Amino acid sequence: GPLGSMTQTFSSKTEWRVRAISAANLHLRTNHIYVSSDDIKETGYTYILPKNVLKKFICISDLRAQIAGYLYGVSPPDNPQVKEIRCIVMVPQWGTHQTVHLPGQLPQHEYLKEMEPLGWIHTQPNESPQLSPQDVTTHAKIMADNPSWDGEKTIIITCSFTPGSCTLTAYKLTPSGYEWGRQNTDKGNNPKGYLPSHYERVQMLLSDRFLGFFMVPAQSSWNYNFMGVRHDPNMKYELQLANPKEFYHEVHRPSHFLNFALL
């Protein structure tokens, strides 16, 4: 019985600080990246992700809120069954632990006109035996709105935060996966109709032989996880040839700095 005896006051806490301290350590995982490429599939299309941009993509991310980048590349001159990822494009986005929210508009820039869209990559808190139904729906709706995304050619790379490390897996949709995903409204973890035959794993190799590069928005940054209302599926954006800033960088959370000035 407190009665009048015991009274304690609430000192606030905040989750983004713990996550920010955590995100400062993401560079440790970049020395320990594993590709879960021991799969039944043989040949098919083979995707080559350069290590430099993958490491950068890991360092700018968050351990809770997924982030995503668009993949662009080409085939080596005389080997068309191999796709080399040459560029990752960060666009205005905001995520949760289960999904990311990207604009309807796809990257547009003359510097990518000689390249080929190869799909997307995104972080994920935990490894999973199967491809998420959120991912199937996302990829299928992007395919339905953008005919340049070939079902036989665009992939979903998941970068999962295993303890001390990052584990990569690459998937593609099947025609059944496409058709189911483009008509799915259930955001839940088990929407009706979702099947494992909706995707298949594709071959994926990390390489040090060549370097990728990044493109980022021209008039903002990519992270909107602190400016959710400023984000809109119909937002338009331009791009520039530059490297992206980490998740908890100051330009991504201006209200923190402007509101601490109010005591």
């Binding site: 000192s11 606030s12 806490k13 905040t14 600080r17 713990v18 920010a20 301290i21 995100a23 400062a24 560079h27 430099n52 950068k56 040459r86 510097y111 032989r209 060549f210 370097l211 990728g212 590069f213 008039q219 903002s220 400023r230 520039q240 040839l241 530059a242 490297n243 980490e246 908890y248 100051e250 330009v251 959370r253 201006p254 923190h256 700095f257 402007l258 601490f260 000035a261 005591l263």
Partner: protein
Amino acid sequence: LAPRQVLDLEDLVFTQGSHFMANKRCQLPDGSFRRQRKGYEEVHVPALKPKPFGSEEQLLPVEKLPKYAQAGFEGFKTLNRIQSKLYRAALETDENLLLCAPTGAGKTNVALMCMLREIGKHINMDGTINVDDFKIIYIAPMRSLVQEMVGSFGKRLATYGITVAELTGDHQLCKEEISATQIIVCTPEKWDIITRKGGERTYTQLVRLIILDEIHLLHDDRGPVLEALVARAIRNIEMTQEDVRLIGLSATLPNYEDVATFLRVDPAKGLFYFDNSFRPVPLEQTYVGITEKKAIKRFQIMNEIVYEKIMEHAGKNQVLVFVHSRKETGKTARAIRDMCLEKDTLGLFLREGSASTEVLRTEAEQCKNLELKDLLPYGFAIHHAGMTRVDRTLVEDLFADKHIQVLVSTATLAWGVNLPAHTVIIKGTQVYSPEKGRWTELGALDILQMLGRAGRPQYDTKGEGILITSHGELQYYLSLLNQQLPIESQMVSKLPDMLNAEIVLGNVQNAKDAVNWLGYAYLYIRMLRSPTLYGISHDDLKGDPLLDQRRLDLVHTAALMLDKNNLVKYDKKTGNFQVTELGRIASHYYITNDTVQTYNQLLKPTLSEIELFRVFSLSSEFKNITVREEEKLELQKLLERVPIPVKESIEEPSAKINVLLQAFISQLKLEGFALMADMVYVTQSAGRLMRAIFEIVLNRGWAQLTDKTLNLCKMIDKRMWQSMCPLRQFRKLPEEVVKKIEKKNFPFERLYDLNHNEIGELIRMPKMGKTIHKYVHLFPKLELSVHLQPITRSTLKVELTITPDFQWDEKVHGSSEAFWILVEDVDSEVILHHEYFLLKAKYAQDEHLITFFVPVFEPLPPQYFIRVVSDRWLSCETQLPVSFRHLILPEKYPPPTELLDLQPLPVSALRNSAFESLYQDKFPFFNPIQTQVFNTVYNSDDNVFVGAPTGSGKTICAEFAILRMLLQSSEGRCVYITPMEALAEQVYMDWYEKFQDRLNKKVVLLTGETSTDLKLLGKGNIIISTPEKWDILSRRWKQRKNVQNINLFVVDEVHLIGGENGPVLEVICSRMRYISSQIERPIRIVALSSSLSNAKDVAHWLGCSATSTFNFHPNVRPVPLELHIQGFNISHTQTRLLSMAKPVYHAITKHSPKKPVIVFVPSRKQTRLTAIDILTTCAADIQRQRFLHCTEKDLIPYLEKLSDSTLKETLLNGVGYLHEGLSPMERRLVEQLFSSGAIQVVVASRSLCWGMNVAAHLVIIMDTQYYNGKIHAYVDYPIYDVLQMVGHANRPLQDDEGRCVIMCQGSKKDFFKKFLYEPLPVESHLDHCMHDHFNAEIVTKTIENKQDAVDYLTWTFLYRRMTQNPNYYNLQGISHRHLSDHLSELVEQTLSDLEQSKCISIEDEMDVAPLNLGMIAAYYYINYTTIELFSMSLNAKTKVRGLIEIISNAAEYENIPIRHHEDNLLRQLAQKVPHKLNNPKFNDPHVKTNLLLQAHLSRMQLSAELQSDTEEILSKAIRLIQACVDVLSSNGWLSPALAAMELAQMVTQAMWSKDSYLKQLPHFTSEHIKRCTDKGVESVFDIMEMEDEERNALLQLTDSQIADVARFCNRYPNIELSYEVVDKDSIRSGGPVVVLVQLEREEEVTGPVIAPLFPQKREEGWWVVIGDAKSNSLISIKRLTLQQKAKVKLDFVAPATGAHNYTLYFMSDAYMGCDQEYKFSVDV
């Protein structure tokens, strides 16, 4: 040395700092008495009685001072008592002084007298002061004191034109304010950090006087700074042997004699002690020591005591109360006034119905300050720093006229304002110290100053000081104020940091240097005099009387400390100290050594802002900060709201420090008193701590962390985060508009696109759209572009262009804006290149070109980035992506020519006994390269290319070709071009011996004189020349047969076409090729070069067959080269040279202990410094004279001929040096001592790497940069110089190998590996040097139209390289169309520039023709821009002085930038010289030429290096003058052309127009002139006609001297002049007027002009002029060179029948006084 002991420095520290009381007892003055009261004691000390003068004491009136000094004492009648005792010592000797007087006795006026003596040292007869010839340092302890000193000294010395100033602290470009100032006034710490940086600068050598005011600060924790300053000054004086005057000013306290010893003050001459009776106003002192231990009671007791003491003066006397906070001032004023209201005493301060209240009525009601509002009407006032300046001046002016009755203030008033009060109360002696983390006693300086403010100097008959403190402190303060608190040294804690500062400067290189350094510290003197006070038993002292062992131990302890923290590397055995970059940073940013170890341990390229703030919070400067329970609540509130998360807990002081910094940036106000003071301390340190972190991570190349830390520096300095609107950095903008702009949440860059209307609309405020617009464009902004020039497949040259895109406003941007250029890799993680870039105000509108190198690799990476970031402005950055998608890399270079294993070639192969005699004595076989090239060179006529390292003997290959020429014909002409004049002269010596002496051929060396050089080309079979001397010749090859009939053209060192003067070399080689193709008689070309990667391009350009192109690479050098490239981490040049000092010695002992060594150094000063340093290291190695290999006595007759004493000393120990400042005979002595094997080591400057007749076994290249003084920046050694230097390590007949150690900055190591181990790619830069050659070729009618110009370009190396490396030349492709367009654009731009300059005419946009201006530019080899400037300035009436000036301002005179010190000399030259120049701006480059010309013409004296510069100026002068003559006569003006010819005369003879024509004669001083004017006429024919009897009776000279005089008189021109007018009987109006002048010299004189003060030998030039001075018209001019006889004809048109007096002129360019005039008339 060997049995050291490691001490505990902290156990030797006086923990109480300035509160340490060394005296056991205090004797109070007679009449003191002790009273008791409840809870406290009082001690009363009566005022002292002045000593009533003395035996020889009289007050000196200003009349009796030296007269230059009286202006400094204007407004005063007589010096005071102490100034009168001090004036002789202070103004009439240079003796170091120490003056001990009580505060206000007049010490700063004695310092003024010392200043006046120094000022008098620099007074000219023109009255002015040589303000640029000296500097004086006044060290004051407090900033407010510094500012008051600046004001008062400035007012006292304005009458001298002397500036006094304080230093800002930025010193970005603000060290300029050091050079502007004569009297620098600063704190000890500021002067310490400045002189710690210790880069080469003039201020150091200008310092003549240092004043250490309030030197009893020695006893304070800040005292060690004074000790460091003094030890550094005295050791600088030892090294420089120039004396500096030291003046110390102190209170009267014990150990003043030890302070005197410490200042090198002779006690008899320079020590003056004045006891406390000499105080201006006697002081009745009251001390109150409270016994109460409990705060609550003690505080009210203090308020009661101050109330009772105030009442003893209310209405009778003003009272100044002193408090140690800005809040407690008002708090105590309110306490007193409340106590007065409660007791109805408030009316005693304010007289009822008196005048004072009236003045108080208004201001008090105005209530400018709020606490002043509550207090001012009642008679009270407060005064502190947070107040406004005008409020403080209000309080001051009110108090001065006796209107305020009680003024509560802080120490700041006591230090910065001259406000005396009759009664002073010091309320408490406790102050919070954040550095210490607790409350401590007041510093002694503060107490002395405050109580010195007691008693007004004129109005009061005594003062009353009332100190209130704790009882236990009574003895202390009694001591301090009564001459009994002894001054001790506090430096034993600071010893590591201070020793590191000396190590970083290089003043202390080992433990013996450190011991000697410490022997100058005040700690050392105190240890000698009171050993037991400093932890030394008296038996310890007797066993070690000079305290050698003890100082060794202290130094050893400090060195171990610094070495554990990685500031130094300390070798215990040798005692040697090695400097490190971390140590340098700790010193230069005033960081303690523990903090730098922490930074080194925790900094990582992966750190985020979180860990960066934590790292900062761990600085040792903060080690005493603690988190108090009473703070913990407020801090917790901030901890969960700070924008940068804090990992550690509120219990840890690092978290409190972190949160305090972030609160400061967020500009939050806090409540806790300790929190505010702790924040102030933390954040005052933050700026320089974070700049140290910045410099650390920047020099490691850490891109992300560099960005974050520079940002954090700026966020600390501007007090705002990046997110804030950058516009609030404009402090003139309102806060609410920028709050609106941040509330609109749009990108700031968008504001650039808008106009003032849209700007008003976006923010919902139209009224401001204009001003905002202005500020948007006042914000600094830079536009960037690149030109990518590939060098190889792995090295890329980048030319970055920076265009400013903002409006400059000096109110906002000052005089300069600073930026960092950062070239970062694909991932923005590695800084591949960086440099500082300074946008000066005068260039705020120009484009700036930066160039640098970066590595690339294959496959090419996507892009690099170039960021240009402001050094000061937040959110001020431009990043340019540098994509490589369209980069065209040149081809991989081909393999070298295989060196064939051939039988070595005997000399017998020449098969000519006369030929074989050239080399028979020297060797029996040619080296492998000569062997491989011999057949092609000697037995064929093919054009040949030989590429090989320096030291491969390519000269012998050229000699092979010359001997083949000599076998084909005896009248063959070989021209030999080499790019350097020193090389040309050395080759001239060697080939003169070989071909003239031994083969009876004629070897000549071109000089620059076109007549001389044309005669030499005629005579010679071997003609040696530099490229420009052959350019001016071969330009007119169509008119000169001797240029065309060249049999052999040899060009040496042809890889120098890639270098700074390469275009001229490329042009002349291309011209020789084109001449060969035109004359149908082929000229054989031989090209010698360093190893070229693109050799085949050169060979094809010069027409060498592939079987005739020998492309060897560096590995084939006949004497093998072991090359070691050693990288040095230090980015500060002077420190890096220091870090190289010992590796130089170690390299000698490792690579060449007994064989000779050359050390190349960046500068003339470094030659001597390094010679001495090598000798010092030799001595400490107890191998003192290892480098001397001859006998001393066999060497001393050599040494007698030197004039450099230090050079003689070093030579005595086997080490020479060589620099431009030595006389040529000194150089030759040193060179022959080195080649004879006498001396083993010689240290030469970089400037001499082309003219050294000396080779070595080991070459050490000590650093690869040098300071350019024109641009005030360090410049990399050209690769060509480095190759030449490396080539000096090669002795084919003496050594089995050569060795070379290149010591360079780490940043450049890999570059050297790529361009020294591999052969060199070379490129043309002719496309930047086009105009003068197009002009020449339009004058010679080789280029008659634009198509001709394209065809002409097709002959160049540039043209060939354009297809091999298109991107380097800004071509996009190699299609024939591409380079056709490129050549057309280049041609179009060049001909457009020429036609605009009026050098050429362009008709129908196709045809080009030479104008007379272009013909003159081409004839005299003048830059077309120079001739354009001449054509603008000259017209028909400009002074000879204007001629001198325009000539000095000509493109040809931008060369030598060594001197900025001599500028003032030139100033005082302007008065001496007849040249009264308008617009007297003085600077660095062309005006040096102007008044150096002035020095020459009036025969003034100059220095050695300056003399070598004079010679170049005179080398260009005659051609420029002749161009002026040529423009004037073409226009028809008669007087100005004659004046220009007389200027030619004055330059040749070094005289003037009206001067005596006897000054041309040898040995003829002005006295001979006055003698010759007496019964004589000033003429040299007059001298000739008298007989040597009367002659010698007048001249008063030696017989050899009159022989020289007669030689001149015989070479003086004496000629028969005859004039005739052909068909004079029948002249008709129009064209036919012909004058015939016959001239005949008698003696057929041979030899050149006699002009000893002119460098090059000249030939007698003449002008025949027909005109009329009445009309100022010249009709007929012809230039003539007279032999034994010559006839000249001249044409002229006869307009109308009329007047006809005609003035036939005969004018010389060489001699003054031979000009003849004949006049006549005849009509048409």
